[PDB]
């Protein structure tokens, strides 16, 4: 039987500290639910009130900044830092972190696929332009 | 305070039924953790005994089949059915479903992006071919 931190207000959830809250999966579940309700300007403001010296603050910061319109390099650094400290996460919290990490990894894969698409778009047009110029040369020669 | 079903054995988590278990987010969190441990053949063997009649069985079935190597149309049908039933999910469970649904929506977007990429690959080769044929026909006539 665990404590229920879900009814905790989203305005006060980012102020709770201690081992009692940081080992409860229902607390971390509430932080993700509360961060999903915030706008990018509020998420970054709450993230500025946190550091990343330990796994607790790094998890809070990553949860807040995930939807704060960050760049793919910024999301990759957040995931990499948490993956290095994920061994310190208690076992009861890890299922929450694993689901959150899988979503962030899918966002990184999505951004990587967007970049591959634009690279193909530019590669295709560059190859099409070369054949076009060769066609214009032959057409002018025939004319 | 909420009951803790995280230490519940993964071999017996699929047989748990009732309103006391299905309204506890820790039960559904353990369900996702246990399904992540199963191979596609084991996930399908558990999910084949269930259907999508209600939100409880549809969620259990979708959690098991998420990593069972299903097709994008099959995952879309599971997500769409659960979205229609998401109104009946209790408030304390919805944070578990929302993060699970967001991960499934990212998999659908990743599948659509990959299909769009191969679509560009075929359209690019088709246009390149058409220019190559035009160039060749121009060369023979130039000769």
Residue numbers in the entry:
A (entry chain A), B (entry chain B): 58 to 200
Task: Pull verbatim passages from the article behind this deposition.
Here, we report that the outer membrane lipoprotein QseG functions as an accessory protein that directly binds to and activates the histidine kinase QseE via its C-terminal domain. QseEF, a TCS responsive to multiple ligands including phosphate, sulfate, adrenaline, and AI-3, is essential for the virulence of pathogenic Enterobacteriaceae. Notably, genomic analyses reveal that a third gene qseG is co-transcribed with qseE and qseF, encoding an outer membrane lipoprotein anchored to the inner leaflet via N-terminal lipid modification. Collectively, our findings establish QseG as an endogenous activator of the QseEF signaling pathway via a conserved regulatory mechanism.
